[PDB]
Design a binder for this molecule. Structure first.
Ligand code: NA
Ligand code: NA
Ligand code: NA
Ligand code: NA
Lengths: 384, 380, 383, 382
């Protein structure tokens, strides 16, 4: 009969976290190939460790791109420009092991399952915990790049814990954790003041979540102390190792597939994008407050072998999940070629997705964020 | 308004799938180090592509292990023993970039899950997908089905009812690497009998497999070359296969190549242990628990119990969570001690899933806290 | 006092020896770049070990070449096409770590380079390296043409001649051949097959029966089986067979490797020039044997050093100092003038990357031209 | 018929030259293995390029050594400690791809040469002796703070006018190219290196009499040298074999030394040939001696031996007669060379720059003139 408060957590990382460096390098190569050959087939994985970038996988393309210069320039853009910060794009190892050799009916290029999610609890239709964690990691990068907080270095991680009510909804911000790389000219006591003011307080006001941040918020800035070296130094990063940061921060189920370094023919990426597009339209059409949708494919088959709509008893208009799914099946063509055509995916738009999340990005104009199927869904259900 | 039937999917892969090669290599090095030094700190990632294995990361150990031999022997066990099958443990590249000292971590979120819909407390789609991929490897190694090669994938789709429960098997996909001596039609007859039919009987789900089942065997034609050749693999790229096949939420953390001091592993194991005890204690049919840690704090900063309205005994999820907090010590050091994690038990976990393994004796599968939970809740 | 017979030895290796695999890959990349962009700057090193090729260095080029496919195809042509032979171009690792960013032009580096020639063979080569190369080329030939079955690519040849008191070859003393093979054949079977189809064939093809009379020691796979070959348990690197590539130890060497270097690298172009000089000195009748050193300073076109030696074989009462004045009159040794006069900006180099850079009767290499004999004689006012 | 002056050149490089980085790393690994297990079989090649060290090859040892730490520590000792200088041992990539009685046969075939000359007190040719002294002094003035603003990579080269008798007569040209900080230019380096490297070494070597009159001195003649080492100049083990030996004065069989334990005849038989050549000259049998030796895989006794003394042979002896004395005194089976020179000791990292021969700063067993008595006594001499 005693009760505990349920506490839900999501995390994000900056573009200088070693796994995110790999995602960004993988999608920088994808975009360079797409800019010159929109039909490029790309399955490029990046590995980073002390002093090393290793790029591996398979491309089919008519484009020429200078991979080592793309890698070095992306590391410099992130801010790894010196041995003093743990990694230097100008002087690091770059090794390439890429193999270059061997319409809606086109079969899926692999089996797999993919989920999409949306909720009207934020303007960007994202869960509050991942939305706040991404806003904090984006702001931590912004204050470094613009000099709002001097003496910062690229690597960093954010983590937010909300209290939740008995109906599975956020009630209150409980705990914020931020860790940032920094120059030795500053110490943790200075960083605590700077990041509390210029990151956390700024983001709470920018997100309009004052109501959720009243009273005692536990804040931990660089709780382990000095954070001088970072990125790949004394560590390792790999493409596709931040797939929950990339999506919904653990609020939504995930099918396992990574996004970065994959062209749009990979259903792991394009069908996940299609499921965000479906979920967002289900919510925007007023059929549910929250919606999660699974799709699944068999290799060589165009039509999904599976589709699974869940709205967690937030369904509206007396509609069941089974009725909403029938409307989705009428309105959306989930054959992989039809997804690529309707969302105009064969464009170099992916390097921007490789840090700070693929979904609910109001800084970007991503096609899977369009709420342009609201009218068709409502009409399929005979709603006004 | 019209209704559609909800279809939920899970997948698994054989030990020959390039990503699972990487998980196994990472956990084989981990086990070799734990055998000689239980206190070893290990953060090893494996990358495979045409002709090469690259092992990267950091180890803090007193143990001497010969990594190139361990890698070669592991590929040969998997069955990659010839250029003919596309990869050879004896003749492939092995490159090691592991730091052993500095010379000049308890954070993140984790989920556990259990359901009483199977005897092993797993969701049916992932339990069936793992039984198919394990059985596909077995029929090769035993020569029950000849002319198979190690790489393969399985996928299972179940119809679900309006209450989010499985109602019947809909679709089975098996894709297997094979010798050029055989084709898709031959694999269809062999695999329907010796893999699909055999597993439906072995699992006792005949009543879920009546009527029309869609079976897709090598649906995209021949699959002669596989493993790393034209299909790069990395450690920790099968984290949904490793866990609950998409039935349960995930925190993002990979298991393989990580020693037990890493909460991405130990805390996810602890949450399986908590979820399984909640369901075994008759508090819920299905339970999902998130935990989360803040750097420098031993006790978790977050815990979140969800039983999807399957609550029993008139208990809310908040009440179940208070009992969990009284019964379970969720400090990482206490998890390591209570589950006796500092043992070379992990290479076995690196394919066919970390949870609900009837073939293994894993400490996070113990339902030894049921009496404590029921006593904390004043139940009989 | 007791006397001993002096015995001089030279060696060669097949195209399948791991060091020569690297030389070949490095020069196959160079040739592919020079084919589409003759102005390409290339400094590409190849490393082979079990399962992997790693290509490293720096290139400046407008050309696109697919390096992984070039590597795999070259390994296939050499005969490494299966895990059973120890290496497979189709399935091996290939990793690339290459960065991509008139006559008065200075040398790109310092360094010293030697050239040599001797009228003891028609190709102007010392007999010990001439014979070692013929054996290694023949060893490759009997495999590719299947004159001797069950052979695998990796092999080494070694020839030891007795020498007279005046430092000239007198007779063949010892021939060594180690060849990679299928496990179906043994040392005993290789010994019969290789004596007939390689050693006896070459002696006849070279016309050296007069030097191969009496008892010759023949050691064929003396260490036993040689089944696993190539990079598998024997790492290779570009520029680790520089004495095989040149005069087999008969002539001095400046230390510079040839393969993976475009002609702007004096290590290559100036060694080629010294061969051309040394060959023309002997062809012009100034000496029987000539060895010439040249050296450069980075950023300076004219050499800092030139040294002629003829080993007291000088003719016409001319000193080495007199022959050298003639060489300075006739030859422009500025790097740009060497590239121009020998037409070096062509894809001709992969051919050079095994069986030697000099004395090649199977190739038409510009540095083997005896086209300056009139100019040398006219400089010495010889008829 | 006019005359030109013959001009002979040799070069050396600092320990910061990318090829010598690879030799030093290969021999640092060999030494660490021999320290714990003298019977270690080692064939370790090092490759360096922008940001990366790759160590490949084969070891058979009972020894555990921490290879990445050895690599990083060696780069730090060399001076590559910053991205600013082009390479940092603390932050660079390190990848390892290593696979793990006296009639004992040669492990390989091949030919090896040794050389000695009484023209210097260390029995070395003057051009390579002077090139090595310059490269060692260029390192010393940087490490000791005699000349500021230097960086590790550098090359030296000397050209001597030679007489009709093939002997050095005059120092003609000295080249030094050094890596440096951007705060200094060629003009400053020319002043500093003329005094603290060139003039210092001419006095240290006692060759003032060869260095009179006009000497062409070329310091950083190609201009600025800010980045160096592996960045834009890939290095490999065994790519400075002529710098390692006699600077082109002597013939060479092709075999590299570094990264090889003493069971490799490429190393031990070249060491034996220096030992033989130096004792021939120390015994008073010749002013200059060059000796080839050659082996066949599977056989202990050499298949070839060749003595050349370039007409400097004394006491009415021919090279055929010197060679018979050599065969009586010297056991040239590999196991016998390893035994007599006590080669199974961690002495090799010190040989990996500044040459393997004529090293008055080391006490190398192959430099011993401990066999002159046996040679004289086998030739029936006083
Ligand atoms: Na539901
Ligand atoms: Na709930
Ligand atoms: Na002479
Ligand atoms: Na002589």
């Amino acid at each position: 009969q005693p009760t505990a408060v349920r506490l839900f957590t999501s995390e994000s990382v900056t573009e200088g976290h070693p796994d995110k460096i790999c995602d960004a390098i993988s999608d920088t190569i994808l975009d360079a190939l797409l800019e010159k050959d929109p039909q490029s087939r790309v399955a490029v994985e990046t590995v980073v460790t002390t002093g090393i970038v290793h790029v591996v996988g398979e491309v089919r393309t008519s484009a020429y791109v200078a991979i080592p210069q793309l890698v070095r320039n992306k590391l410099i853009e992130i801010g790894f420009n010196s041995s003093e910060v743990g990694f230097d794009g100008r002087t690091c190892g770059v090794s390439v092991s890429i193999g270059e050799q061997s319409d809606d009916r086109a079969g899926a290029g692999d089996q797999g399952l993919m989920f999409g999610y949306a909720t009207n609890e934020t303007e960007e239709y994202m869960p509050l915990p991942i939305a706040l964690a991404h806003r904090l990691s984006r702001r931590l990068t912004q204050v470094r790049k613009e000099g709002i907080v001097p003496h910062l270095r690229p690597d960093g991680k954010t983590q937010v814990t909300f209290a939740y009510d008995a109906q599975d909804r956020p009630s209150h911000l409980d705990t914020v954790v931020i860790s940032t790389q920094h120059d030795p000219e500053v110490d943790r006591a200075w960083l605590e003041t700077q990041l509390r003011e210029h990151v956390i307080d700024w983001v709470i006001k920018d997100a309009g979540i004052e109501d959720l941040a009243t009273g005692e918020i536990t804040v931990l800035i660089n709780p382990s102390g000095s954070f001088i070296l970072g990125g790949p130094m004394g560590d390792a990063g790999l493409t596709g190792r931040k797939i929950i940061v990339d999506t919904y921060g653990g609020m939504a189920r995930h099918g396992g597939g990574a996004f970065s370094g994959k062209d749009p023919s990979k259903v792991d990426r394009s069908a996940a994008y299609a499921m965000r597009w479906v979920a967002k339209n289900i919510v925007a059409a007023g059929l549910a407050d929250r919606a999660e949708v699974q799709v699944a494919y068999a290799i060589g088959r165009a039509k999904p072998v599976g589709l699974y709509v869940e709205t967690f008893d937030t369904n509206k208009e007396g509609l069941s999940d089974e009725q909403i799914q029938a409307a989705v099946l009428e309105v959306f063509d989930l054959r992989p070629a039809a997804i690529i055509r309707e969302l105009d995916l064969l464009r170099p738009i992916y390097a921007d997705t490789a840090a700070y999340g693929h979904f609910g990005r109001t800084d970007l104009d991503l096609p899977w964020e369009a709420i342009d199927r609201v009218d068709e869904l409502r009409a399929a259900l005979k709603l006004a």
